[PDB]
Every structure is written in C-alpha cells, then in structure tokens.
Design a protein around this ligand. Structure first.
Ligand SMILES: O=C(O)[C@H]1CNC[C@@H](O)[C@@H]1O
Ligand SMILES: O=C(O)[C@H]1CNC[C@@H](O)[C@@H]1O
Lengths: 620, 620
C-alpha cells in the first residue's frame, strides 16, 4: 500500500531514468511483442517525462488511438545493486501500461495519474538492461476518466438525424471521445526511476497525523502542545525503529524508539511542545526521520509533515480552529509542449502566480497532480483540494463493477500517496457526475457515491473532509451533493445559461443561494467563469471579451459576499488549457484568468485587487 | 475668403455629388488632359468621399506615386440653375487638384485639408455635365505636410553605408516618403457638392464673436448680459440685412436690421440678456439668421454659434472666466476602408467615446478635420485645438518662401473656415517643427514662426490663444515654444528614451517640469504614450503590453498632478491609426488607448476612471 517517494540517503539511492527515450506508435488494440525483446526498429525520440502527443509534428499524435511503445537502455554499477532490493517506479503512465525488462513481463497497471512500481531485483542484470514500456491511451465507458464509446466528445456538436452523418459515423477512424473537457494527453507523463532499499528489512510506508492541538495561539502560529501520531509499516523477512522529529532548522525536538510488531508495524504518539503550526500563507514543516535499528542504521526515510488541524463545524471550515475562506481556482497540469507532462519550472512559476494573485488554494482538477507540486505547496503555504480522475461519470458507470473498482483504487491510491501533506485539506471523490433527475436516478447516484465517501474517510488517517464537485444541475432533485462535508458547486449562470445577462445571472444565483442557505453546510464555488480571448475588448463587454470576464466576477462575487455560510471562491480556471477540438473550444478552454502562457487577463488584475483585501482567516 | 458650408433654404439649394465615381490612375508627373473631354476609358469604381488607397485590392494604391483622375456625370433641372449663381465646392482634395467641367479647366488648388470652390455658372450646361478631377498625392520638401525628397520616411530604418543600398536607392520606384508619422492617404477625402446662391446679391461670409460677458453665473451656465458682434460680407453687383438670433428652441430672442456699406459689409453688436453660455460638458448653441432684404427675402444663411469667452491669464486657461483643465488626446481622421475619408457614423461614435472616457477635448492632429466634426463638437460640448498641416518642418523649409506662403495659406484658410465654432479654443500653427540646436538655428526657427503666430492672432476675430506643438527636444536651446500663449509639449520619456524605466522617466520629466515652472506659462501635454498591442499582457508589464501602457499613464499623471501650472493632459493617441510601413510600426501606430476598431485597451479603462474624477473647471 505504501508508495513513499524515492529517496537517497546513507541506506538508499535513486537512479533516475528520465531523458530522451526511443519510441514507436503501435496499433489500436495491440503492439508487437518482439518490441520488448530487442531494440525498437526505426525509433523516434521521445522525452520523458512528457505527454507524447505534442512532441512530434511529423505525425499527428493528437489523433492517435491505442498503444505506443517506449524503450531505453540503462546500466548501473554492480557494486550498488549488490545485496539491495531494486524497485522500478513509474510516477505516472497515462492511462495503462505493460512494462518489460530484458524481455520479461514485469506487470501492468491501469490508472493514468498515480504511481506504480515493480521489484526488479531478479530481472536486472549487469551491463546494459533493456526497458520497454507499452502505454495505452484508450478511454471509454469503463475507464476513469470516462470516454464515450460513440457519438461525440463532451460538449461537441452533432447533426445526428442526418442519414449521411449516421452512416459516416459507422466507418470513421476510431478516436478517443473524452466525456471530460480536457485533452486526453497520454504517455509517460511523470518521472521514471530505479531505486534501492535494504532487502532484509525496510521501511515501506509512513503516516503522520496531527491528532490534537492544545491551546492554539491567537494568530495560529503555535500551539501550547501538539499531539502527533506516527504509523510506520515495514517490509522484508525484537526489532525497533527510532523516530526523530526535526523542526524547520533541522533541530531534533522529539524522539522515541518504538517496537516493531507483526504487516510489521510500529505506531505511537509524540507530544510536541510549543509546536509551530502550518497555515495557509505561513507554512511551517517538520521532518519525521524513521531509522530502522539493528550504532549503525539499517534503513532510513525522512518524511516531511506539517502540524495543523482541519475541521468542518457548522457552516465554517476551520484550519487550526480559525474560519478559513478559500481564494483560488481549479488548475490543470497543462502546458504547450509538455501536454500533461510534469514540469517543475512551471510548477514553481505557477506557485509564484498564486502568490501574486493573493490566492491561497486550488483544486487538482480533475486528477491527482505530480507529487512535486504538493511538496511545493507544503513549503509555500497553499491549500489543496485533492481530486481523483472520476470525471465524466453517469448512471452507465454506476452499474459497472469494473468502474466501481477503479474508482475505489483511485481513492485509496490518491490518499495513500498524499496523506502526509499538510497542504491537503479536503478530498474530492468526483467531478460533475450525474446526480439529479427523476425516478430512481438520484437514489442510484447516492447509493453509488455514499460508500466512496465512507472509503475516503476510512482511508485518510487525518480524517479530512470529503466532498464531491457538483455540476450545474437541478439542485432540488440531487440528493447526494447536500450530504457531503462541504458543498462544492460548479455554476455558470450568465455563461451557459442566461447568456450575457449578468442581472438575470445574479438573480438566478441568488435563488439557488437561498436554497443552500437552509442546508446548514459550508458551501463554496469550485468553478465559475467565462471563456475570454485576450485582446478582445469592448466598452460594454460581451461574451469572450476581457471586460465581460472581469464584470462576470465582479457581479457574482458581490452576491456571494452577502452569504456568511459561503466559505470559498475557486473559479474556473487558473489558465487556458487544451481540449478536444470542437465548436465551443477556441484553441482549447479559454476560461483561464491567465493565458496558456500564464499572462494575466483584465480579470486577473481585478481578482488580484479583490483577493489582496480578503484575509485567509476571519473574512466571514 | 468666406467658406460658409453650403446650405439649403428658400433662397439656396445644395446638390451633393458624392457616390460612386469613375477613376483611373495616371502618371508620376502627368495625366492625360484629354481625359476631361470624354468619359474615362476602362474606369475603376471609386466611392467619394474617401481616400482611394484602400478601395481596390487588385491594385496596390497605397504604393501609388503621382496623379489619379476622378470623373462623374450629373444633370440638374434647368429650373434649378435659372438665374442663380452656381458654385462647385470641394470640401477636400488631398493634396492638389486640377478641376475640369465639360472640358473647361476651372482651376487648381494646393492644400489637401481645406475646402475650395469654383463659380461654374457659365461652364454648366443643360443635360449631362462631365466633371473631371485630377488629384496629385505627391509630397516633398516644399509641401505641407512635408515629404522627404530622398532617404527614408519618418523613423524609417536604413543601412546607408552599405554600397549596394546606396546604389539600389538610385533606381528604386519613386514613392512618397512622409516626414510625418501617418499614412499619406490621398484622393477626394471629403464631400463634393454643387450649390446655388442668388446672383445679384448674396451672403458671402459671416463672423460671430463673443465680445463681453457681464455677471457670469457661479456655475457658468449663464451671464446676465452677453455682448455679441456680427460681421456679414456680401457678394454681387441703401440695402439692409436682417439678423435674427434664435435660441436653443428656435425662439427668436433678438433681432436687428443693419445697413450694408461698401466690398459690401454689414456689422454691429447685439446684447443678449440672461444668455446661455457654451461650456465644455454643457453645450448651448444659438443660430444667427442673416436675411438679405429687398415681404420677400432675397438671400438667407443660418450660422450656428455659441456664447463663450476664452482667455489665458497667467498660468490659467479661462473659459467663461473659469480655470479649465484639458482631458483628452490627439486624434486622426483614420479608419479601415475610408482611410482619411470623412465618415460621420465614425465621428458620431468617436464623440460618444469621448464622453464614455470622460474626456473633454482633443486636437486636430495634424491637419484641419472635416467641417461636420466641429459641428458635432459644438453640439456635444467638446473643446478643440485646431491645427494646420505644418508637420514635418525643419530649417530646410524655413528658408523656402513657397513653404511660408503655403503655411500662411493654411493658417488663413483654417481660421476663415472655422472661426465661428465655439468648441475651438486655441489654434496650433505647427506640430513638431525643428526649434532647438546651436548657432543660428533657434533664432531662424523663431523668425519663421513669430510672424505666423501674429498671423493667427490677426486672422481670428475672437482672438483665441495660439500655440505651437513642440516635439521632444533640447528645451534649453529652443527659444520659440516658450513664447506661445500656451506651451504644448509632446514628451515620450520612458518610451523613446529611458525605455521601459518609469522611475527614470518620471525623474527626467520632473527635471524638465522644473524648467517650465520658471518660464511661467500655462503648460499642457499634447502628446505622451506607448505603443500597445491589445492582448499582450504581463504581470510586470513591458513595452507593448497593455499593462505597461496603463502604468505609463499612472506614473506620468501622478507627476503632473503636483504642478498647479500644468493645465491639461492630451495623450497620444485616441486610437491606433495607419502609417507608412516601417520597423517601428506594427500595422501602423499603436499608441491608441483604443484599437483602430475603437475598442478600449486596459489604459482606456484606467483613464476613464481617472477622468471621471477630474472636473472641467477648478481642478487646479
Ligand atoms: O465547461 C467548462 O468550462 C468546465 C465545466 N466544468 C468541468 C470543467 O472540466 C469544464 O472545463
Ligand atoms: O511617435 C509618435 O507616436 C508620435 C510623435 N509625435 C508626432 C506624432 O504624429 C507621432 O505619431
């Protein structure tokens, strides 16, 4: 279950395998087996990590349907593999992968946004090793995220009653049709690395929780006492682990030696006096150093954490007992050449833009992001809502056992990967599933999602709030969204309805806010916005102008400011991003307040001024 | 000398000749004179009024050098012409024109921005008449506006030391090289019309002046008494003219009968009790109706006017005795298909944008505008600085008597055309002539311009202030600008110098403002700005971004606000406009706060908010 990010220390070394690999496209539903057994014939270069789709302009890899095959060679000194346990980790392969080393199948994985690994201790040999990775991009009614098996991509146009169209559909080239509004970027989107651990006994997992804070300071910077809990899991085979707690300067401030008991596990609690708390806008990180003891150390791992509590109380969202207000947006992992490929230069820039805007938060719309972004937000004081790739779902998916299992895998896998981050304050178990309607449909949706809500709570040792991000719907027949811990709504009054009429949009919004006012839950926007082409201007801004986007937020935000139970504003989107092509997507989704190259539109400046005057705590 | 705009009434009729004419291009230095004798061979269509340059995409008329020939036919009933004096009026033919009617050369005109007319009574005949107009676009060292005889256009790039460049220049196609930063649009840019007056005696010119205001209300809306004077000139041959003054509702509020004395003139004064004054932001217009008396009326003309005084006093600019502050910009007559062609839809729209912006004024950079725009600003309460086409001048021109004569012609013609407009508060006798330097250059410039300053004063019966718009220069050796009635300066600190460094730009500006503080004259900007491409954005705006343009005005305006003697801010420009092509002009000049299609950039919104808070009177 543990998926600790690979670390190098006195006991452990990481050997990255990123770089320019060999690559070939393959078939709609197969690829040649012999490509795992010998060097790829006539290979193309392909950089990893990165989506493959925008890395070759001679081919139209955006249109590719099915498999591709990556390959590279590598060699490491026998000295450093001798006696060690050898693990090959894929941070992400989107969506499914088969992995081979030296002509041997290592195994496969489904799930394009979470890491997986293989023990290669026995498949490795000295000299050059040949690593082959086949990656499948296909999506459909059984995948998360969901594809459409026929018809159109999400918000695509059709003339389905025209006989010629119906007939041409039967013979059209197979293409993935996302039931979600972002491009289906595929390939080795995140890092690949070989790493070592000791073989006889090793640290497999660590969970740190903030159990209780006694007497939090008025400014929330410290607490008189913090009770933290640790849970260390071991692999391999009267043994002990030493746990040292280091503060922000590396000083040892606490330490215990705990007994390992047979899963081999050690768990306990540690009191940290005068603890320095983690807050939005004021991060503070500790390190838990776990050392497996035999003066010598057998194994070690350093786990960053921050001390803070999260609690929903009535219509408030309390961080360290203080009423928080979210300011931010949904993001995407999306950029020009990389596609969905992780890029830490861009992550660093985006975090600085979050600060420039005076925002404090975002959601990982619509899939878990690369692990390095959460470390960055841990150090930079930015709060995250962590979301699984359960986007595009409807009643067709609720009746499918395979989908339900993939959904539980994604929830368990996201929380197992991300549980130690102090920046994560809430889990989202889906984006815009179908919840409303007549007959049994609302109850069917509820019966599908309630066990997943329970699973997210059971899986997280911090027991953080759980939400489900709700599409614009008939809120009077949806019986699911109102049962979440925080109500997170996506609304486009004045854009997809009441188009351009901000008076009517605000009237409609206020009618629905009157509905939520009586529910007793904290409510926030997780999306709202307007497609905007930079450089389109008007004195009376119409849809797609920079002025209309600014006016849109000015009018809507004035209405939610009147509601004390409305605890956050996350807009859509941080920045323009790529989508499947169609008649409503002008080079992708243009609801960004920043352009795809991260330049600010008029509305970004307006928002920056607004958010500069809204405090993280106590706004409401 | 009078050029009253043609009017239709019981004594007079106007027959417009606009529409789609026939057109041919001709030679660099000649056209076929026989084209006036018969319909043009194989003619192109060409709408009038309009520049010709953008009306044909099969030809490259922007590259044309030399002559073109317009032609059309017309017929009018014998009853219309019988007994009448028939005048053919060209509102503007840019730059020079030869006019033929039924093969007879009527005459020629130089000066591309002011009207001229011919008596055609004897050249007309019954049935179809054939009107042929040859128009010359050429500019050079003796024209106003000034062209360069060799080298490059204004702020063009060159590599003049490369031998191949020097040689190719000798054989390059002839092309006009503007020594001014706007495109040399040519042709019948303004209306053409045939009009009638009585033949025996007729009204030839009217001047109305505001002589004195007694007891002006605190809000300047009225005066207890206003003394106005009239001066009517007659043509033809104990006769009398009735002068009636009509208020805003058409009510005759005053009337006098004057004796015509011989060059036939009638002159006198009228006192208007509780006169409603014309003010920026609060226009009020009277009509002076002059009726030539024999029961019957022989001739009549209705002249609009507004009652207001203009006086420079110390460092203030007094309208109706109140300290005025200019808010506005230089403009251009420039638009997509029309070029420099007059377009009243666009004039109406532009005056509404001036109100939207909360501006109160503009300058007719860099030529007299179409007459209809001044009538519009009369009714809409927008102040005008009226400027002759003396742009591009330096010491080569001051030594040329043909240029001095053309310059005197332009000044007399502008003031004779425009003297009755209340919206005009100041005359500009040149834009950015060479004034500074060493040796005898500063004195030579002074001796050239001082007589023209005196000429503008002698020509205007209202005796309004006279300025010269000064280019960015060494203000310590320029001895001419400081002798103007208002000092009008164009400054581009932080754009063309100290580029992008707004701290240094403001420091430089303050050093020069310290200079003008000691001179003791009222000072205003007539230009300052930054080229800006809509849709270019940055968090720290660099040159060409929307943010830089906004920051430019925010920083510069903060500095002039500290100077009580700085009486106005006219920026460059209202809207992006066309120029000769070159390496610093991205589809023309982009210093507009509006795009060429009149859409607001970020700076326009900022300036609108600034100008909303600055009163027309009493800001300083
Ligand atoms: O339509 C939109 O702009 C948004 C609607 N909510 C879901 C987003 O993925 C999508 O991009
Ligand atoms: O350089 C500029 O942008 C301006 C400088 N002053 C004169 C203007 O005609 C010109 O357009």
């Amino acid at each position: 279950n543990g998926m600790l990010y690979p670390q190098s220390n006195d006991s452990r070394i990481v050997f990255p395998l990123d770089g320019v690999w060999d690559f070939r496209t393959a078939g709609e539903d197969s690829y040649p087996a012999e490509w795992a057994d010998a060097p790829l014939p006539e290979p193309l270069p392909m950089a990893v990590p990165g989506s493959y789709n925008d890395q070759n302009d001679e081919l139209n890899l955006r249109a590719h349907y099915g498999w591709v095959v990556y390959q590279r060679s590598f060699a490491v000194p026998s000295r450093l593999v001798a006696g060690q346990r050898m693990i090959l980790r894929f941070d992400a392969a989107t969506h499914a992968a088969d992995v081979y080393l030296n002509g041997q199948l290592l195994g496969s994985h489904f799930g394009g946004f979470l890491p997986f690994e293989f023990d290669v201790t026995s498949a490795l040999h000295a000299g050059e090793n040949l690593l082959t990775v086949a990656v499948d991009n296909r999506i459909g009614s059984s995948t998360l995220p969901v594809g459409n098996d026929a018809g159109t991509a999400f918000m695509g146009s059709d003339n389905a009653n025209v006989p010629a169209v119906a007939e041409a559909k039967k013979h059209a080239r197979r293409q993935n049709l996302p039931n979600f509004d972002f491009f289906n970027f595929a390939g080795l989107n995140r890092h690949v690395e070989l790493y070592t651990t000791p073989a006889d006994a090793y640290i497999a997992d660590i969970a740190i929780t903030t159990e209780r804070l006694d007497h939090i300071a008025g400014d929330a910077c410290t607490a008189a006492n913090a009770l933290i809990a640790y849970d260390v899991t071991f692999g391999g085979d009267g043994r002990q682990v030493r746990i040292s707690i280091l503060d922000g300067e590396g000083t040892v401030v606490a330490g215990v030696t705990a007994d390992i008991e047979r899963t081999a596990k050690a768990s306990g609690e540690i009191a940290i006096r005068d603890a320095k708390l983690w807050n939005p806008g004021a991060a503070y990180l500790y390190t838990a150093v776990a050392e497996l003891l035999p003066s010598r150390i057998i194994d070690a791992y350093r786990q960053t954490f921050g001390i803070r509590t999260v609690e929903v109380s009535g219509t408030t969202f309390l961080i360290n007992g203080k009423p928080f207000y979210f300011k931010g947006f949904g993001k995407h992992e999306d950029s020009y050449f990389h596609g969905r490929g992780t890029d830490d230069v861009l992550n660093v820039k985006d975090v600085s833009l979050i600060h420039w805007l005076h925002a404090n938060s975002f959601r990982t719309s619509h899939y878990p992001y690369a692990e390095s972004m959460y470390d960055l937000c841990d150090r930079e004081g930015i709060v995250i809502i962590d979301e699984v790739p359960a986007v595009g779902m409807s009643w067709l998916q609720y009746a499918n056992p395979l989908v339900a299992e993939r959904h539980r895998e994604a929830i368990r896998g996201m929380i197992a990967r991300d549980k130690n981050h102090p920046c994560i304050v809430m889990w989202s178990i889906a984006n815009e599933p179908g919840l409303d309607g007549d007959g049994e449909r609302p109850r069917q949706a509820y019966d599908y999602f309630r066990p997943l809500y329970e699973l997210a709570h059971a899986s997280d040792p911090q027991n953080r709030p759980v939400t489900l991000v709700c599409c614009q719907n008939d809120y009077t027949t949806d019986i699911t969204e109102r049962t979440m811990d925080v109500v997170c709504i996506n609304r486009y009054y004045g854009w997809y309805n009441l188009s351009g009429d901000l008076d009517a949009a605000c009237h409609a919004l206020n009618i629905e806010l009157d509905f939520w006012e009586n529910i007793g839950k904290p409510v926030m926007f997780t999306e709202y916005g307007a497609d905007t082409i930079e450089g389109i201007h008007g004195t009376h801004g119409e849809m797609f102008s920079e002025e209309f986007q600014r006016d849109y937020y000015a009018r809507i935000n004035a209405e939610i400011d009147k509601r004390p139970w409305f605890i956050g504003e996350q807009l859509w989107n941080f920045a323009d991003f790529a989508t499947f092509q169609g008649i409503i997507r002008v080079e992708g989704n243009r609801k960004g307040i920043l352009t795809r190259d991260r330049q600010p539109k008029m509305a970004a400046h307006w928002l920056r001024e607004r958010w500069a005057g809204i405090p993280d705590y106590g706004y409401k």
